[PDB]
Design a binder for this molecule. Structure first.
Ligand SMILES: *Cc1cc2c(cc1C)nc1c(=O)[nH]c(=O)nc-1n2C[C@H](O)[C@H](O)[C@H](O)COP(=O)(O)OP(=O)(O)OC[C@H]1O[C@@H](n2cnc3c(N)ncnc32)[C@H](O)[C@@H]1O
Ligand SMILES: *Cc1cc2c(cc1C)nc1c(=O)[nH]c(=O)nc-1n2C[C@H](O)[C@H](O)[C@H](O)COP(=O)(O)OP(=O)(O)OC[C@H]1O[C@@H](n2cnc3c(N)ncnc32)[C@H](O)[C@@H]1O
Ligand SMILES: *Cc1cc2c(cc1C)nc1c(=O)[nH]c(=O)nc-1n2C[C@H](O)[C@H](O)[C@H](O)COP(=O)(O)OP(=O)(O)OC[C@H]1O[C@@H](n2cnc3c(N)ncnc32)[C@H](O)[C@@H]1O
Ligand SMILES: Cc1ccc(O)c([N+](=O)[O-])c1
Ligand SMILES: Cc1ccc(O)c([N+](=O)[O-])c1
Ligand SMILES: Cc1ccc(O)c([N+](=O)[O-])c1
Lengths: 555, 555, 555
């Protein structure tokens, strides 16, 4: 194609054309796609995501957007595209699914960048192994896809998938990002083993035991490396020998991932989701403290989650379906909605897995522990209305994907999500302070507070859900202001953020400044050593190649 | 001091002297120690380890040995020593305890290197936190030290330490090496969070949330960075934000570690070790298969271990105390010794943790499962003689360190350990093949086979114990030959090794050659980028700085 | 000499010795002085200042301190010392007087640095010219010295010196720093013309018209450049032709200044100091607003100053001589002390200069303007007790130096000054907000607020006087905390600082970060271009040469 709406820094249209001309010859025109005009700038839907920019844009819609899109047919193409990118110093921005909304979606940090759609063609579930209780996968496999594959193959009785709320995302895309999930296998990054990735220099590289070569059998002769099988231990033990480099690949521009090993929980032989509604707002504090020991003690098995009242209601209804009021709902109004829905001002969803004797025993401990809270009330999914959030999480908590939760994005008219995500201690006092600070700022911006803690062993990801109408420019600015201020306040109180949207990766990296930004400095060193040309996703997590001046690029 | 018995490559005695002269001015003479003569080359004891070379030398005793030794008083000294090392391009080789015997002990890969004794002065238990259920520590803290600290502080009822067999090693030294331990917290590397290390350039760097700075209070003003407190989440969540670099620090020369966060298991409120003796040699196969599901299913909680007959006997007695025979004992003789000691030809030690109802239920499942094996017999520690290996592991399985196990090193006269450690699937067929291959080679070398599997979730570390008399030069050569051959055979069958001795790190790295040694190549890139001068432990895990020619150095 | 208590970064004692050995050969032993021991670390007095470190240390006393001291005999030596410094890459830190206390005194930012005492030998008043109404001077001339020179020469009737509070400082040292003074000639940096300085490369360079060479007369033949006379216009017009580089020399490490032109106010033919006591604390606001127009309108001629009550009392008495209380005095107590001393809660000192008709007219306007304030009261020096602060400033306001003001440093036991100095608008509202913020933080730290505004045309330097006992380590930390917090708060409100102490130049430079620290980046470029080796005062104002890593050095 001819003229992109915008282009990478320091490059002529003459060069873009020779570059794109060459890519089309490689992947064929069916695969390439140049962004020539506004009618191309459509904000999709979660069901059919837009690969050109951020769907949930806090900033201008056309702010971050690609010059083109390119779907490699397979690994060889990636190696090739990468080679061309080096010739032109054209920036790439890889993606498996494009489903990362609330964190910038498919949009690239630096505009005019070519977006590699790793997912379109490399869609394959490469392997599922019952004895090893794991599988292998390409960037294209969403959670739903895997679930079906297990189900078609009747393997669902043998092994369970762990899954985040909405089911559409890339299994590996979410993994590299360290996204959370609900079962005992909830920490996604923790559950991987052996990976494969294309370096900036286009060379292939497996990791961990992935490096020990599978011995040569007559049947495997002549295979290209990307097609060669993995050795037996590759997916069973992550460490390998020597330095453990896998982390360099999480949340970073060090290289493009092509396949990845992921564990799978054997069917536990027992399950029963549950609920415990906390009556008061202040109950958040005692509940957390009651939880701390249950988590360390292994009473609570999976990643449970304390949900705010509005989150469950957002799933059940629009703000309009509850109040004509155009401002943050009052504590009074919040108490009222809970009475309508039968929920507490906070609501703890969780689960039990195992044979009955284990389950019965755990259930006692849990129920007995939470009783210290006046007014607590325990419901099983059966015990609730056929639309309840519980009936839904009951599936999420057992590997069944769904999409019912997107409904909450609809609280305001033109829904658009934006996640603020500070980490917080498994402490009632710390959790209480974080909530208050986040709430007041929200009120200042005119937004309803909404969030959910997701309980890790020694920590909790506090996930603030900023819903906002994507067409009110004023609200957007208030929102940008909201984010930036929240970042600084929590920072000023020991709180970090585990992930964020393109428009703030720079600010958040800056919070990580102990010892004069020593951490970032070490990374850039690794970065430039690995990708001299800064071809791969420059600016991810705030790491900039030497070519990009921090003055022009930071934000 | 004046003249070291050997010196680093490419360096004058004139330079060694100016270098050492300067170090003495920094750390004071009490801290430095030059190796001038043979009387200095004493092979210590496990209780008082030698810092100058390998105690268990398969190779010549004086092969790998330092030019001097230097104990930094604190972090500032390390930064300083490092700075001098760069001026002279003198190679450093860090160590916390020196306890890594069976993997080369305190000896450096490249001879004449200065050995940093990080442990002598930086001995402090920096923190223990009950709510977070973790602690922080300097290189000097051994497992015993921590246990006492917990016990002095009466905290032992609140939190348990995880511990490897012998208790003397460095808590962090073993952690960076990814050493195994017995409780549920057995995977040491997995249990860390937040670290601190000195880069080749001497700059400080915390990691993970360690990077988010603790807000400034009047009390903490003026503190030097190394003395500054960590932010609240630092030890609670390992990921931080951006690339997860911690692995670059495991089994590698990327930098020197100064402190490290480590988790601690809350007292489980229940415990009972157990034993299950497998009668026949061939029972190894079914036992493994019976185990696979129990492990994934969480029936088996901690890292259990299948011990070979001779290992338990070595603890109970010398080969001489069982046979005047100078060659590998026959299967007949092996069957006989088991009858004497009441053990099976294989013996599964493990444990249960939790309230009685959980414990009772698990015990049923386990006992019921293993019964498929004809002749199995279950003993509790009480049910056995007051010297039994079980009475010992009962302590190991609950965080109590010991030293009773060193007795096995004594099988031959001049005991000397050497660990061959291939990883193997949690499969009876795979486990059986690995054992046979390892045994035959052992027989070829005239050595008794001895080993123990240590069961991970999806894998098992097969630990071959090569005992050999450290004074028979012939036996040593047979042993070198043994190792090298075993490395190649297992390689030729998909088997890797998770760790090894200095004399074979090069060979083992070479097994990891998928795609033309792509893995090693990526590392050297990272290496040279990070330490231009190759000052830090060159050759660790086989990674060589550009200065060392692979022709002269590899081995 | 042999061994300095500390040394510059990256340097051997062997090198220090060869370096110092060579300097001694140049300047002779009388001039050099190595710091070998603690007895050398004496905190002097203002009358006999210590050249080795900070007298008023907020930080550890021995924190910032030189390796040695060297007094060049003349310009040639400076050029030479500089040349040696380049060979060794030894850092220099120039100073004229050492009188910069409350900003770190004679101490160097980077420790172990050699301190050039420019003042000892280069002490000469090079010229005084009545028609041009200016003079020329070396680094050694203090204000008192110049005053005497004028007075010996009977020139005092012809021209007046402008002078800061205490009279001991270097006329040029204070000028390059942009220090303030009391007469109409109060802006010191503004009053200079033509300078001379030694570049990092040791080359000489005059500036402005200083560059146009004085034509050659037989009498001036053979003169060395440093001894050559200036052309006629050199001291009369500052701009010269082409880029105006003089500013590169203010508050920066660009080069060492050797002489400098400075204007002198012709005797005005009339003078009368005055006072106006504002009764209430809140009167600060209206007073400022009444002042704004008087300043722009030229009613107020010199740099007047609004003094806080405690400042005048500190001069009159110790906190102990007013209250046994160990904490910040109450507003009540403050009102009481004013009644005792006859002063307002704020007190405006200023002056009139000119023939009587001008003076009479101005006096009316001023008196009439300030009357809008209820309770104001106007005193002439005559109208007050023979110890009054007014009797003192009456001299300061006419070029007469004094030392009476040091008495205020004595408020606490071990007096030690530390200046916080944010700039503020000539507005009652802005001035009021700044005062409140600064006061509350002071109260938080347990310190009495004390300060004085010094009124510029369109702005006011708010000078917060942090007195603190230099031996209470706790108080010191509270103070460090005080400074750092004040810096951030004022920053968060548009307020900058025109100068500061070594321990905070880095933090303050960071406040100046518009557009991604663009300002600092531009400077480092200029820095490294000019001094490749970073020999000259690295870290001044936060500007670091490329050799110093920002991670290790910043603070
Ligand atoms: C709207 C929403 C989002 C959401 C959620 C609930 C709602 C209502 N619940 C989630 C949850 O419980 N846990 C979670 O982690 N995320 C959840 N989200 C956010 C989002 O939907 C998911 O995180 C989703 O998995 C993200 O999208 P996807 O998984 O498809 O990722 P992507 O679009 O490919 O972007 C991935 C990013 O990582 C890097 N990347 C991706 N692929 C590669 C390859 N092959 N190589 C290198 N880097 C890669 C890119 O930087 C890209 O930005
Ligand atoms: C003889 C023996 C050994 C043994 C064992 C049973 C017997 C009878 N059981 C073990 C077990 O159950 N699990 C295990 O991991 N090891 C066991 N061993 C072997 C050995 O005793 C232990 O592994 C022991 O912990 C190792 O010694 P130590 O822990 O003291 O380690 P070290 O002497 O300091 O050497 C550590 C190596 O790692 C690197 N290193 C160490 N400190 C640093 C720092 N600060 N910075 C950077 N790198 C560091 C070095 O490369 C060094 O070689
Ligand atoms: C305690 C105190 C201080 C004070 C004051 C009242 C009291 C009670 N009143 C002052 C006032 O009204 N105005 C003012 O500007 N300062 C006042 N102070 C602070 C201090 O006493 C004076 O500012 C004093 O003039 C500073 O000391 P001095 O003038 O002697 O300066 P120095 O010791 O030489 O340090 C100068 C700095 O500038 C750079 N420098 C100095 N000479 C050179 C040369 N030749 N070349 C290059 N740079 C040079 C150095 O960086 C040095 O740090
Ligand atoms: C809904 C949601 C969004 C982003 C996250 O990171 C997340 N989590 O549990 O980690 C959950
Ligand atoms: C005894 C021993 C020696 C080395 C190891 O690595 C080990 N392990 O369990 O990992 C156990
Ligand atoms: C007393 C004092 C101290 C530092 C200054 O800067 C100052 N000034 O008027 O500029 C006055």
């Amino acid at each position: 194609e001819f003229r992109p709406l915008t282009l990478p820094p320091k490059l002529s249209l003459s060069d873009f054309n020779e570059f794109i001309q060459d890519i089309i010859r490689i992947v064929g025109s069916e695969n390439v796609e140049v962004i020539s005009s506004k009618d191309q700038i459509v904000d999709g839907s979660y069901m059919k995501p837009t690969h050109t920019h951020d769907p949930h844009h806090v900033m201008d819609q056309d702010y971050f957007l690609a010059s083109a899109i390119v779907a490699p047919r397979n690994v060889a193409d990636v190696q090739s595209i990468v080679g061309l990118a080096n010739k032109f110093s054209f920036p790439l921005w890889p993606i498996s699914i494009g489903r990362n909304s609330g964190y910038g979606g498919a949009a690239p940090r630096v505009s005019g960048s070519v977006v590699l759609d790793m997912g379109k063609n490399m869609n394959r579930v490469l392997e599922v192994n019952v004895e090893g209780a794991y599988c292998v996968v390409e960037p294209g496999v969403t959670y739903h896809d895997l679930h079906n594959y297990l189900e078609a193959n009747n393997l669902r009785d043998k092994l369970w998938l762990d899954v985040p709320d909405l089911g559409g995302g890339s299994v590996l895309g979410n993994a590299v990002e360290r996204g959370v999930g609900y079962t005992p296998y909830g920490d996604h990054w923790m559950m991987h083993s052996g990976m494969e990735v294309v370096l900036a220099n286009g060379e292939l590289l497996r990791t961990g035991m992935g490096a020990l070569p599978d011995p040569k059998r007559p049947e495997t002769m002549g295979l290209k490396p990307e097609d060669q099988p993995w050795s037996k231990i590759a997916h069973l033990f992550p460490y390998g020998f020597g330095p453990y480099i896998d982390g360099l690949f999480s949340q970073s521009n060090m290289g493009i991932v092509t396949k990845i090993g992921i564990w799978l929980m054997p069917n536990p032989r027992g399950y029963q989701s549950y609920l415990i509604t906390l009556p008061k707002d202040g109950d958040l504090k005692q509940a957390v403290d009651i939880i701390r020991p249950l988590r360390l003690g292994m009473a609570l098995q999976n990643v449970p989650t304390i949900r705010h009242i509005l989150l469950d209601a957002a799933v059940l209804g629009d703000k309009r379906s509850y109040s004509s009021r155009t401002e943050p709902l009052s504590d009074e109004e919040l108490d009222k909605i809970a009475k309508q829905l039968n929920l507490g001002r906070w609501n703890f969803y969780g689960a039990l897995y195992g044979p009955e004797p284990i389950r019965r025993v755990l259930w006692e401990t849990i129920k007995d522990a939470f009783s210290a809270i006046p007014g607590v009330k325990f419901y099983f999914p059966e015990d609730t209305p056929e639309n309840s959030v519980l009936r839904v999480r009951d599936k999420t908590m057992q590997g069944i994907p769904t999409y019912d939760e997107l409904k909450w994005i609809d609280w305001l008219p033109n829904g658009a999500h934006l996640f603020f995500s500070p980490i917080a201690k498994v402490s009632g006092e710390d959790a209480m302070m974080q909530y208050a600070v986040t709430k007041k700022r929200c009120q200042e911006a005119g937004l309803d507070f909404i969030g959910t803690f997701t309980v890790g062993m020694r920590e909790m990801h506090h996930i603030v859900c900023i819903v906002f109408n994507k067409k009110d420019l004023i609200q957007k600015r208030k929102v940008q202001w909201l984010m930036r201020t929240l970042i600084d306040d929590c920072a000023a109180n020991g709180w970090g953020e585990y992930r964020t949207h393109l428009a703030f990766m720079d600010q958040i990296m800056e919070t990580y400044n102990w010892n004069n930004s020593s951490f970032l400095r070490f990374n850039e060193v690794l970065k430039n050593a690995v990708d001299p040309n800064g071809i791969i996703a420059p600016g991810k997590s705030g790491v900039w190649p030497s070519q990009y001046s921090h003055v022009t690029w930071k934000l």
